[PDB]
A = this chain, B = another copy of it.
Amino acid sequence: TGTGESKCPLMVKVLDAVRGSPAINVAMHVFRKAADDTWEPFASGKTSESGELHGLTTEEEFVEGIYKVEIDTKSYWKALGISPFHEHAEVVFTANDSGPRRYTIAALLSPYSYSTTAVVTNP
């Protein structure tokens, strides 16, 4: 724990609906809406063997703000030889607000359909 590494107050889990297994090595970039309305690169990384992303931020760097989770669905499908639909699966939301909170972004991937859900815990 320091300045945005290892704590787990935000986890992204990506699944493959076609294969019925976790979506591994999916590129994704977490952004943060700056006062000048533009997106500041917050976190960068790929999904593990479990199809998850751990310790993206600390309970100190993950402050109140608008976040963009850009999941690279296209490169996942194109690597499997599939011509999909979306350029990327995007998730835009306001974080913590009431107080420090835990977030899980689940994304169910099909080439021509994506399903995104948020699950909130009470820390």
Contact = CB atoms under 8 A, between A and B. Distances in A.
A46 to B, nearest CB: 9
Copies of this chain present: 8
Give the contact-size bracket for chain A: 35 or more
B90 A120 contact: no
Nearest to A110: B17
A94 B122 CA distance: 13
A25 B85 contact: no
Contacts of A24: 78-79, 81
B15 A106 contact: yes
Nearest to A122: B98
B111 A117 contact: no
Nearest to A86: B93
